[PDB]
Symmetry: D3
């Protein structure tokens, strides 16, 4: 469009017409979604109430869990293998409370999630098989996020959603009968410092806290004394943004903005 | 000696550092423009490249990868596409006056982040000894192409380390010199440009040389990308009151290390 | 909680009451600290002043130096090996002046610091042996930090401080009779663009400068022309923030804020 | 079996009864096989006549080709990408002469085949999908084999055939609907210094040479002047072993012998 | 001085090297038996281990991996299996008199071949300072388990390098000493044993302690493996005229480096 | 061919006529050679004698030393860095005695030589610059060789000699105006258990020994007691094979026999 007079107009036409970007009800049509978590519990803690709301509407929610949570205990007589047996059950129970379908366990070791083509391939296979309408994953640009598994899951999820659409990427998948990942599915990023879409989870907050504490191994009383205020405060930082008590924040952008975009901060 | 930080900084920039952004490319005879994929040089600084050629600067591309993955055409393999994209780029660069292209040949979506790639770029720096280097800004927020983050990091690193005789010393052992210490670094694809080039006059050219990457810009995909790319050129151009612009971030060499007030330029 | 009215109230309760956080005097009880540095001289440059005052208060200050500084010369006649043996001597004398106990050399090669589990296990074994009260390290989120040794030292430091506390992490340390790293120690990040604790070093500035120049292989006369003003200017950026002439800046935060936290900018 | 009197008897009962190992007609029942090659052309050069014989009998032969042959030319105006386009066509044409079904291209770069869990996963997916009755691959113990791609394909093929049977190995495959690789398929190793099964390829030798030269890019006249004597001599080393002019040799052992077996040299 | 190679070699072995295979474990108070998976120590040298315990030697296992992949039971995950296999191994080792087990915890089928693993074993060598080390022979032909090749290589390497103060120096920095220089290395699972232990008397014990790894030896799988394992014990036993034996390859430390006549022992 | 009667006849025709192979005088035309060594001293130990005779004939002999020898000391007071600077001095003087031109130091760390494309590119750039007539390197198939630096130097050497001849391999070398490595050069492997060419060094033995001992950091009196007999014994193992007192052994083969060849034991 050669004759438009200001950046601001252009950007506006770009968002609303060219890209028809819409934060009003961005999960309106979804039938199936994947929620990707670095560790068992992260989906519920980041977006449990949202997962529930989706379930409630008849959306199929599938988990993909990058690691086994092997490392997450201070108990010197609980091995990582035992912990991981336990966290699997804990996540199955938590997810059942949220109406969640199915979990894909990638089984990478807790704290050792690689950042590699290999991991992109695992996700790409799930993506291609399930062809979901939207994907959720932690925002790897969250500042002071000191857990490598979190930053890497984030990155790998965004990369995989783009690359799994390309037939020459992980090409054996197509050779065993899968199609590339279908275009026009959304990415939504939770655990974000810059959300631009909030789900009100005021009514659901006690459901979320319950489903979080089901991961008992992660949440004994002395830990919960700190974690419950923390989780509640986080939910209020998000909710206030839409004038409600408790929210879950997401960052959702048009696919182009994840690449060469110097004005991403205008959504 | 000096009283305030505000004063101390100013003196740093202008006296001690000589940092000056009015004409940062006025003394440039040879430059490298480093791109992660074929087409990134033209999309991100195609108009500036034209401007540099027309001025007589020699402009040399270094493309990190082969564009192998860039198609949804299931009847086009990566190898075929890679061979087409080197053609596309050769024609695209002629239009902008581009001399020479070094292809490193890493696979698209697979550019490593490692000492090996630093050694490939170092060997080129030491060979060509350019006056300035262009590369994507590795800090662009929400940049989710690893090839992009990786390129910018490795470019800035390599410009530094290629200067060190003990770094990839085999280069010296075979007759190369360490990379000269006077050169500039300019990052394109940047959210914090502190230097903008007006390409309002060149915009139609820029767009034609982009379109020359036909594998990347079929008809339906240009339906979003021409509007996208104009909208970005307006973003940079507005910063200096022109229609279309190209944004570059530039900084004294020092600021890339241990510097808490980099947002002051 | 659960009754608190607003996000602003929750946040302040969380910070001060639940998490017991305050930056009045965060090094108060410290008997032993590790100063983790990517290259010989980084401890002196970013926190040389603070080290001295810690020595002065009778705190045992220990260095961990991630790499050998192999690459840090433009002299064609000086091999990397020769340089490393020099820089070690330089560090030892620079550290004498700051009253510095003892230095662990990891001996990774300058410019080639891995970002790997192996390096966490190196840090972890040290933390488990020393059991420091506090650990200092570069902020790996510093804008525009382009030395991979710095960003990587920073992230590895934060990660090791968490993981060294887990008994299933690097479990052989335990099998050889080291204990998990003790829980309550602090983290302080230097070379930072968002400091929230400032140490006045104004009275110490000349000693700091002398202790840096002791790295003569790094600061001959021609480089010192650029670097002395630079170093003075950084120290004034930090000093200004609390109204003293010369300062050293540090970023400190509750432990929980290193993970999924979306309002880390409020401190 | 507690009361057997010599090693030699035991070993004999072990082979013939316990393991019912049979080198008489070891491909008798196969319906589908995979032939794994490091580069395009290796299946034909190592075992072209055998592939043909299998085709002839109605066996489905599927290729898996580890690399793209990107590196295999001395022509300074033929890029690796062009070479690889060309070698794909060359292999399609060669394979058509041998009755070959289908080729899986892993697309790893020629000379850069990794030795990694990732590559095991690609093979494991093909194995699980196709469930073939037997697999062929170069013998990685062939002495003085100086091509890394050859040694690694060999190893990876033997490992994958064992690991793809295990449900916890590459577990996402089972989560997208695949079953583990079925038990009791044979491995046969070509390019071997110790074959214990030879296929007579006297009648087929000229077919093989033709299908080898179809890879024109690899076989110009000046190269063929050396390669044709070489290939013929190799085929006679194998054939003489069964008193025929030209053979293809394989090493075939019972699955147990690929693990902890100190008497493998007795077959 | 000396006239023939045959003479020069002999003198090497016996005078200069003191290499002597009649009772190589006569002076051994503590030994490490390094296994790639839980059960390899008992399968490969279970009877010898028994013999060493009964003699008073302290026997310490170092297991490289967790056995995570070792089941076709689709209702048993790797983590569950790993937790069962550590139990299995604890019971199995008690029966043979085994003290202590170091678990390194790498995943089964994933043991890296790297400096990191050498540092884990080195830390144990330096801690425990054993008199001898047992490990699989990395040269077994047709050994196709990477965990197996990898273990033997890393064991022999680590025994060497743990002796070097500059190697994993942090160990020293925290109070450990380099690994003492007097110790032996013996490779089991070997096709070229030059020392055989008669375990004819212990064979039923060996087999019971193997069976204790019940996850690995259901009924139908033991239908092949008991015959397999007896057939291997006959292989080694025949070498010295006994019914069942365990084969070890042993060599002067020198022979592991630059030695063209290693087949002469 | 195609008419030849027996395998034994084919093989001898192949070796002698097609491949022009013979070990009468394989270094005849050599003007320039690389002696590739894994650690400082390996060239002198395995082929010190042969080097001298090459110098003596006026051949330019160049060393490539893969690593710095950092680890090679039991002295707790001598750092790896210090050792490397020493060993370089030792090499330089040891090489003066063998009339050795010039040494390329790659500077990988003793014990940590990668097995990677990066290292082939290091060798390749050297071969393309020097264009040697011959390359000497350790046999990576030596029985029981337990130093990973040796096996890896050996395989990397053979691989680089092939790949450096391909223009698409490390193509940037070409873009900077180096040529592919010239085709007809020979490969000779030392530290070998199957030598097929023997150099009489009997008259040179005392000089060899002096040139090794010049590595005093490696051979103090106590280690020399073990090592002098050892070195004498190896030289007699090789000498015996051609009826001289002291020899150096080398394995040489046609190029084709480095790949898929099943009768490499016939030479
Ligand atoms: Zn998590
Ligand atoms: Zn790009
Ligand atoms: Zn530094
Ligand atoms: Zn091949
Ligand atoms: Zn095992
Ligand atoms: Zn050596």
């Amino acid at each position: 469009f050669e004759d438009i007079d200001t950046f601001e107009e252009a950007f506006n036409k770009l968002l609303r017409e060219v890209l028809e970007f819409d934060l009003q009800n961005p999960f309106k049509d979804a039938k199936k979604v994947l929620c990707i978590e670095p560790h068992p519990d992260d989906c519920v803690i980041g977006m449990g109430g949202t997962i529930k709301k989706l379930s409630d509407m008849g959306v199929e929610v599938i988990y993909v869990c990058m690691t086994d949570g092997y490392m997450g205990t201070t108990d010197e007589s609980l091995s990582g293998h035992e912990l991981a047996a336990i966290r699997r059950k804990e996540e199955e129970e938590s997810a059942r409370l949220l109406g969640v379908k199915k979990i894909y366990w990638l089984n990478y070791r807790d704290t050792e999630l690689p950042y590699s083509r290999e991991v992109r391939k695992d996700l790409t296979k799930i993506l291609r098989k399930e062809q979901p309408d939207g994907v959720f994953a932690p925002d790897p640009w969250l500042p002071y996020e000191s857990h490598p598994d979190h930053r890497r899951t984030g990155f790998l999820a965004i990369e995989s959603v783009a690359f799994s659409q390309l037939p020459n990427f992980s090409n054996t998948d197509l050779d065993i009968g899968l199609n590339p990942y279908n275009s026009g599915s959304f990415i939504a990023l939770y655990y974000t410092h810059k959300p631009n879409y909030i789900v009100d989870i005021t009514d659901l907050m006690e459901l979320k806290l319950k489903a979080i504490r089901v991961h008992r191994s992660q949440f004994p009383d002395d830990i919960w004394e700190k974690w419950e205020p923390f989780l509640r405060t986080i939910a209020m930082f998000y909710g206030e943004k839409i004038g409600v008590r408790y929210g879950e924040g997401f960052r959702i952008m048009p696919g182009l903005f994840y690449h060469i975009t110097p004005f991403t901060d205008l959504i």
